[PDB]
Amino acid sequence: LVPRGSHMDIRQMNKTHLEHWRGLRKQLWPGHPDDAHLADGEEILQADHLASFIAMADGVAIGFADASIRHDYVNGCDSSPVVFLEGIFVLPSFRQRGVAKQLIAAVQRWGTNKGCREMASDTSPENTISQKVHQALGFEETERVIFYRKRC
Amino acid sequence: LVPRGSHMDIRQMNKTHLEHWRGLRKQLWPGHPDDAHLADGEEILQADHLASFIAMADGVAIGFADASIRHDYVNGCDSSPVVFLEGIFVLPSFRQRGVAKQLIAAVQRWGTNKGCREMASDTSPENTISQKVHQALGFEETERVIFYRKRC
Numbered sequence A, B: 001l002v003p004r005g006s007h008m009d010i011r012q013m014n015k016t017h018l019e020h021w022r023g024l025r026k027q028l029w030p031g032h033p034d035d036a037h038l039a040d041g042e043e044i045l046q047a048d049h050l051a052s053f054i055a056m057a058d059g060v061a062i063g064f065a066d067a068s069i070r071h072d073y074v075n076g077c078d079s080s081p082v083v084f085l086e087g088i089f090v091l092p093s094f095r096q097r098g099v100a101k102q103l104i105a106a107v108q109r110w111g112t113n114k115g116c117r118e119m120a121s122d123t124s125p126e127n128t129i130s131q132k133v134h135q136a137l138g139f140e141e142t143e144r145v146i147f148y149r150k151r152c
């Protein structure tokens, strides 16, 4: 069978996606231990406010997005709760083809169905590609900020 | 009575502080309507996770701080929940005297007693004075980021 190509599926990560997801995520956060990633998957799966999305193509995972629902203050946002995009990543060899586009779309649709008026997100200044992408997908830059931590 | 000066009290904003607080806050967020500020005071007062602190000096309000407890992800933080410093402001004519220092201290002590391992905060790049202050009070700059919003 050849006149076509071979479909891509954006699916919500359930437990049978845990290794595909872990595999891609190790490349978004190289520095976060396999154990850590596993812990996270468990947490995500079970939580009402956490969701992930995997973009499967011909039985393999080529991109994912990590969304959460924020009930706290959220830089540049007017309403609550907010659908935040915590992490999105598409295998190099599949970028600029609308994958992250669909992934982000499925993170919006999830957050809409969960009450969220706005889909927030964030990126690093050194991340120009990320910055552009956000703009291309209709995200408006709201504010830039510096964060601090102090132990209690 | 003269050999001394005249004590300053950092107190947690209850309802009999609502106009002193509103008065100072109008100068942190000029652009937020008196109505809005009032709404906020009500909300703060009643919520388990919201707290404010007023620095009273000789019966008048000279500085305040707005803290919240964050249960969502928090840029540059390792634990949850986090005591976030949403807003701090000290009348011009009282800065550089340790007021914000005590105010921030009382926001830490509140957030400690509420489980928080870390006290987070944030500021704008154009805010050099804020930036310095944070450093002086032992806050380490964790990360800088750009935020985005998209409607759902």
Ligand SMILES: CC(C)(COP(=O)(O)OP(=O)(O)OC[C@H]1O[C@@H](n2cnc3c(N)ncnc32)[C@H](O)[C@H]1OP(=O)(O)O)[C@H](O)C(=O)NCCC(=O)NCCS
Pocket: A028, A086, A087, A088, A089, A090, A091, A092, A094, A095, A096, A097, A098, A099, A100, A101, A102, A122, A123, A127, A129, A130, A132, A133, A134, A136, A137
């Ligand atoms: C951000 C990232 C997920 C984008 O993936 P993607 O597959 O390239 O996304 P899309 O192809 O759907 O791009 C959507 C839009 O961004 C633009 N864009 C994508 N890649 C771009 C690039 N590398 N440089 C400039 N513009 C780019 C597309 O042209 C545009 O399409 P449009 O014609 O509808 O405007 C990224 O490439 C990634 O996979 N790697 C690093 C992870 C990262 O940056 N994370 C961000 C938050 S954690």
Ligand SMILES: CC(C)(COP(=O)(O)OP(=O)(O)OC[C@H]1O[C@@H](n2cnc3c(N)ncnc32)[C@H](O)[C@H]1OP(=O)(O)O)[C@H](O)C(=O)NCCC(=O)NCCS
Pocket: B028, B086, B087, B088, B089, B090, B091, B092, B094, B095, B096, B097, B098, B099, B100, B101, B102, B122, B123, B127, B129, B130, B132, B133, B134, B136, B137
């Ligand atoms: C940030 C602000 C609250 C500081 O108030 P403050 O009364 O001056 O704070 P403190 O005097 O307790 O200062 C603590 C430390 O910061 C330093 N500092 C204070 N003001 C400073 C200034 N104007 N320039 C440089 N360093 C400064 C103090 O020297 C230092 O004391 P230390 O000897 O213990 O290191 C500010 O001045 C304010 O009131 N106005 C604008 C509001 C704002 O910037 N908000 C920030 C987050 S919403």
